[PDB]
Symmetry: C5
C-alpha cells in the first residue's frame, strides 16, 4: 500500500490524541515511568471514500492490513510500545478514525534540585517519518487528549496532561520528521519524608547537642559519634532512592551541611576535654556555654540561607 | 466480520464471569497483584443459529477466527492480559459460550492506614467499547464467578470474590463504554509482625527505660542512644516493605511517636546528670523517680489514643 | 477438528507422564520453583487407525495441526508453560503418542514450621477440560514418569518424583475436569544455617552472659546491648530469606525467645547496679551467682521444650 | 516433512559445532551463566540434491520451513534458547550446512569448596531425540568449535572451550538420545577478595587482640565486641554472594573459625577482669601475657591446617 | 532470494550508519548499556534498477520480504536486537536505502582504574557474514552516523559517537566476516561522589585523629573503633556499585590505605595507654605529640603518591 495522494502539494495531517488510562511505576533512579493509554489517529484517504446512499452504511470498518496506516512511533520510549487496535472507522468522505490501546516504558528526565519538594514535567513524544510520496505532519485533536479521573501515580500528584499543539518539524536521516510534545505535569507527595527521614534526622542532631550540657568526655564522644553514624545511615538511605546528579539536591545539601555540625561538635568536645585536663575548666566552660547558643542559631540561619537558594 | 444485528434498537449484552484459579504476588510497594483466571463470555448471535434436527448436532464449536467475538479488555491491568482460549460453543438459538484462561498483573491501589492490621478490596475491571453498528453492555453471570478452594495469597486471607452486577455505562472518545467491577476482599495476616517487629521494638524501648534506675550518665547515654539506633533500623526495615503514602499509617505513627519518647529520655538523662554535677542530686532523684511512672503511663495512654484514632 | 468418538458412552482416557530434565530456582519467599521437563500424552483415536500391510509404515508421524490433541494445562502454574513438541506418533490401532518438552514457573505452597529442618512436597497439577462431544479423564502411565539422575535443586535434596495415579475428577462451570497430582518430595540442606546463623547467634548470646561475672555496669550495659543489636541483625537477616507466615517457624521461635533472655539479662544487670549503689552488694552477689546457673539451664530446657513441640 | 532416508540401516549423523561470541552473567547464587554463540549443524539429505549445470546455482539456500532440520535441543538450559537462523546452505549432493546464532541461560553447577580460589567447568549440553523413521546421533566437527578472542567473563579467567567428541548414546522413553558435552573451563579472579574482604577482616581481628595489652575491662569489652560485630557484617556480606552449600567453603571455614577466636578473646577479657577484681592481678597478668603469643600462633597454625585440608 | 550479482569479482559494500535516539541504563556491575537507535543500510542491487521516465516514479518502496536484505548482526549485544523497519527505498540505479529502528542491551567492558574519575569508550560492533555467492564488506556512511541532542546517559557525560571507518575483515568458520567499530566516548560525573562518599569518609577519619588530643583510653578506643566501622560501611557501599576487578581502582586504593591509618591509630592509642599505666606518660606524650603531625603528613603524601600512580 502507498500513502494517500495529495489534492495539491499539501502535506498529510495526521490528527493525534492520547488519553491516559493507567499511569504507574515512576522510577526516580532510572528516570522512567510506565504508561497505559489510548492513541487515537485521524487522517483523510480519498481512496477510501464512498456514497452512503449506494453503500447503505454510514461508516466502514477496516482491518489494519486492508488500508494504509501512518507509521507513528514514540521517541523517548525505552522499548517499542505494546499496542492493540481497538477500532478503525471510515466515514463517507474517506476520513479514517484509528484507535489503539498501548503501554510503554517512557524515559523522561527529572530535576531533583528541590527533592523531595520537587515538581516534574513528564514527556511523551509522538513522532512520524515522511515517506518519499509525501510529507507527514502531526496535529493535536484537543477533544481526544485527556486522562481518567482514577489515574494515580503512587507518591505523586498529577497536575495536568496537555499537548504542545504546534509540532516540531525537522530533518533526520534525509527525511522530514514531525514530533509532538505531550506533557504530564506532576508534583511529589513530600509528606512521608517528614516523619521518616527529616524529623528522625533532626532528633539525632539535637541529641548530639546534649553534649554541650555534659562535662563527661566519654559520654560526649559516645553521644556525637553514635548520632553521626545514624546520620551516615540516613545519608545512605536517601542516596539509594535517588540517582547520581551533577548538582546538589535540597536534601543532599541539608544532609551534607549536617556533617559539618557533627565535625565542629567533635572539635568542641575535644577542646573542652583538653582544657579540663590542662586545668583550664573556666575557658572550657565559656566555649561550652557559647556552643549552646551558637550551634542552634547557626543551624537555623544556615537552613534559612539554603531554603532561600533552593526556593 | 461485523457484530450481531439487533432485533430492535436494543444493545448487545455480553454476560461475563471470572473464576480465579491462582491468585499471587501482592506487591505492597507497587500496589499490584498477579491473577490467573478463567474469563467466560456469552452473547447471542442469530447468524450462528441452527436446527438441532437437520444439523444432527446439539452445539457447534468454532475457532475464534471463524466468528465475531466482542473485544473485552481489562482497565487496571499493567500490560495486556495473557489469554488462551479454552472453548467456543454455539447452541441452536445462536448463544455463544466463550471461555479463555488468562493471566494479568492487576494494578489496584491499597489503603495502608491501619497497616499491618489492614483489609483491602482488590479490583478487576472488565470493560467493552461499543462499535458503530451497535452499543455493547456488560452483565454478570453469577454462576460463572468464583475462586478455587486452593486459592492462597501469601501473607493474606481471601475473604470474598464478588462482582458489582450493574455496569458503569459512560461515554469515552464519543463511544459508549461498559465497565464491570470484580472485587476481591482480602485481609492481612498481621501475626508475623508481632514477634518480628512490634515485640522486638517494645523490648528495645523498655530497655531504654532501665536508665531511670541508673545514676551512671555514661551507662544511660549508651542505653538510650544504642536502643535509639535499633529503633532507627526498625523504622528503615518497616518503610522498605511499604510505599510512600500521603497519610500516616498505624505502624508509622507508633514508630514516629516512639522517637519522641527517646528524645525525652535523652533530656531526662541529661537533666539528671547536670543536676548531679551542680550538686543537686535530691532534685535529680525526684525527676528520675517521676519518669519511672510518667514514661510507661504516657506511652500506654498515647497508644490508647492512637488505636482509637486509627480503629 | 473434533474429539475421538466413543465406542459406547465411556470417557476418553489421556495417559500422561512427566520426566524432569532440569529442576531449579526454589524461591522460599514466593513459594515457586521452575521446572524443565518432558510431558508425554497418549490416547486412542480410532479415526487415525490404519492397516500396516496396505499403508507400508508401522507408525505415522503427524504435525499438531493435522490431528486432534487434548488441551492439557497446568493448574498451579504462574504463567502458561513454555512447550515445544518433540514428537507425535500413531500406531496401527490408532494409539497416538504425543511428546513435548516444556518449562514452567510452578506455584506450590511451602510449610516453614520446621525451618530450616523442613521437608516439602512440591506439586505439579495437570488438568483437562471435557468438551461437549465427550468427557476427558486423565491417567498415569508409570513407565513414562521419572527424572534425570543429574536433576539437582540448589540447597535441597530431591527425595522422590511420583504421581497420585487416581485423578481428582470434579465439576467446574458445568463441565468435567480431570486433575492429576505429580509430587516432588524434597528436604532442605540445613548444614549452611549452622555455621552462618545458628552458631554465630549462640556465640553472641553466650557473650552477653559474661555480664554475670562482671560488676562493671558500664561494661555490662555495653555487653548486653551490643550483643542484642547483633541478634536484631540475625532476626532481620533470617526474616528476609522467608515469607510472612501466620504461624511460628522453628527458627522464628528460638529467635523470639532469645529476645526474652536479653530482656531478663538487662533487668539482672540493672538490679545488680541498683543494689550495689543502694549499698547492698551481698544481695546483688546472690542474684548474679544464681543467674550464672539459671540462664544456661532455662535456655537449655526452653530449647528442649521447643524442639519437642516442633518435632 | 520426514527425516532423510537411509542407504542401509545406518543412523543419520548430525555434525555439530559451538563458537562462543559472548560469555557473561555468571550467577554464583543461581549456578547459571549466559552465552551468546553460533550453533552450526550439518547432515546429508539426498532428497535436496540438484544439478548446478541445470539449476545455475554450486549451492542452494533454503528457509528453515522449506526443509527437514533435526530437532536439536540443549539439555541444561533454563528456558528454550533464543535462536535466529544465519544460513542454511545445501550443496548438490544434498549436504545441509546450518548456521544459527543463539543466546541461552545455561544451568551448570559450581563447586564452591575452594572459594574464592576456585576453578569451574561450565557445561552446555546438546541433545537430539531419534524419530521413528531412523535414529539420530550427534558428532563434533572440531573445525567449527571455538571461542572469540574478545570473550571475557567478568570476574573470571576463561581457560578453554572444548567438546567431548564421543556422544552419550542412551535410551529414554523407548527412543535413542544422542547427547554431546561442550566444556568451558574457567577460574575465579580472587584478587578483589583480598583488599575488600580478607585484609579488612584480618585488620579487625588484630585490632581485637590489642585487648591483650590493656587492663581496661570497659575498653576491652568495646574492642572485642565492636570488632566481633564488623566480623558478623563480613560473614553476612560473603554469604550474600554465595548459595547455601551442604559443605564448608574455604572462606566459610576461615570466617567460622574466626568466631571461636572472638569467643575465646571474650573469655580471656572476662577472666582477666574477674581476677583483677578478686585481687589476683599477678595471675591475670600471666594469662594476658600468654594470650599475646597463643592467639597469633594458634591463628597462624589453624590457617596452615585449613589451607592444607582445602588445597 | 539470492544476493546481488557482481559486475566483476568485487565484494558487495553495505554502507552503514547508527544514529542514537535514546541511550540509557549503564550498569557498572554488569558492564552493559541499553541503546535505542536507527540503523541505516545502503547497497546496490542492479536487479532492482528501473528507468524513472518509463516507471514514472523516482523511487520504489518495498517490504523486507520482497527484496534481498543483508543479514547485519551486532557482535557484543546480549540478546538479539529488537528492530522495526522504518523504510526501504530503491533509487532508479538499484541503490537500496534501508532504515530500521532498534533497541539492544550492549555488552561493552569498562576500565574502573580511575573510578569515579574515569572515562569510558563504549562499543557497538556491527558485523556481516559473507554468503557463498559473494563476499560482503561493511562501510561507514558518516552522514548517517550521529546522536540526538536530548541523548542523556544518567551520571555520565557523552563526549562523542564516531565509527572506525576501516572494517575488520577476517575469516571465521571458513567464510568472511566484516566487523565495524562504533565508539561512544563518555566520562563519569564524579561530583555526587564528593559530598556522599569522599568528604563523609574524610570527616570520619579526621574524627579518629581527635584521639591524639585525648589521654582517655576508653574514649580513644570508642573514637577509633566507631569511626573504623563507618569506614567499613563506606567500603561495603562502594564495592556494591562496582564489579570484582583483577586490578586496584582509585577509590579502592584510598579506601584500602585508610584501613592502615586506622590500624596504626589503634596501635598508637594502645602504646599511649600501656606507657601511661607503666608510669611513663612523658614517653607516651612524645608519641602522641608526634602522631598529631605524622598522621596528616603521611596521609597527604600517600594520597599525592596514589593520585600520581593513577593519573
Ligand atoms: C613499641 C610497640 C610497637 C607495636 C607494634 C605492633 C605491630 C603489629 C604488626 C601486625 C602486622 C599484621 C597482632 C596484634 C598486635 C597488637 C599490637 C599491640 C601493641 C602494644 C604495644 C605496647 C607498648 C610497649
Ligand atoms: C582523599 C581525597 C581524594 C580526592 C581525589 C581527587 C581527584 C583526582 O585527583 O582525580 C583526578 C581527576 C583527573 O580527571 P582526568 O580528566 O581523567 O585527568 C586525566 C589526566 N591525564 C590524562 C594526564 C592522566 O581530576 C579531577 O577530577 C579533579 C576534581 C576532583 C577533586 C575532588 C577532591 C575531593
Ligand atoms: Cl513506539
Ligand atoms: Cl486486558
Ligand atoms: Cl499451562
Ligand atoms: Cl463435583
Ligand atoms: Cl461434562
Ligand atoms: Cl534448547
Ligand atoms: Cl543483533
Ligand atoms: Na497498513
Ligand atoms: Na473474532
Ligand atoms: Na490439534
Ligand atoms: Na524443518
Ligand atoms: Na529479505
Ligand atoms: Na561505649
Amino acid at each position: 500500500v502507498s500513502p494517500p495522494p495529495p489534492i495539491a502539494d499539501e502535506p498529510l495531517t495526521v490528527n493525534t490524541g492520547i488519553y491516559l488510562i493507567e499511569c504507574y511505576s515512576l522510577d526516580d533512579k532510572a528516570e522512567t515511568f510506565k504508561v497505559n493509554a489510548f492513541l487515537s489517529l485521524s487522517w483523510k484517504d480519498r481512496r477510501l471514500a464512498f456514497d452512503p446512499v449506494r453503500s447503505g452504511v454510514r461508516v466502514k470498518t477496516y482491518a489494519p492490513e486492508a488500508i494504509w496506516i501512518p507509521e507513528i512511533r514514540f521517541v523517548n520510549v525505552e522499548n517499542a510500545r505494546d499496542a492493540d487496535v481497538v477500532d478503525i472507522s471510515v466515514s463517507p468522505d474517506g476520513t479514517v478514525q484509528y484507535l489503539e490501546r498501548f503501554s510503554a516504558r517512557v524515559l523522561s528526565p527529572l530535576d531533583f534540585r528541590r527533592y523531595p519538594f520537587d515538581s516534574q514535567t513528564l514527556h511523551i513524544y509522538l513522532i512520524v517519518r515522511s515517506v518519499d510520496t509525501r510529507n507527514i505532519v502531526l496535529a493535536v485533536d484537543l477533544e481526544k487528549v485527556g486522562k481518567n479521573d482514577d489515574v494515580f501515580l503512587t507518591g505523586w500528584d498529577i497536575e495536568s496532561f496537555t499537548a504542545v499543539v504546534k509540532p516540531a518539524n525537522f530533518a533526520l536521516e534525509d527525511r522530514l520528521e514531525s514530533k509532538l510534545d505531550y506533557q504530564l505535569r506532576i508534583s511529589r507527595q513530600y509528606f512521608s519524608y517528614i516523619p521518616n527521614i527529616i524529623l528522625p534526622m533532626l532528633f539525632i542532631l539535637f541529641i548530639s547537642w546534649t553534649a554541650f550540657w555534659s562535662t563527661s568526655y566519654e559520654a560526649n564522644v559516645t553521644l556525637v559519634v553514635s548520632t553521626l553514624i545514624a546520620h551516615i545511615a540516613f545519608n545512605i538511605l536517601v542516596e539509594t532512592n535517588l540517582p547520581k546528579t551533577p548538582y546538589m539536591t535540597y536534601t543532599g545539601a541539608i544532609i551534607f551541611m549536617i556533617y559539618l555540625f557533627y565535625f565542629v561538635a567533635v572539635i568542641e568536645v575535644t577542646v573542652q576535654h583538653y582544657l579540663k585536663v590542662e586545668s583550664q575548666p573556666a575557658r572550657a566552660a565559656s566555649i561550652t556555654r557559647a556552643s549552646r547558643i551558637a550551634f542552634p542559631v547557626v543551624f537555623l540561619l544556615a537552613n534559612i540561607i539554603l531554603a532561600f537558594l533552593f526556593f
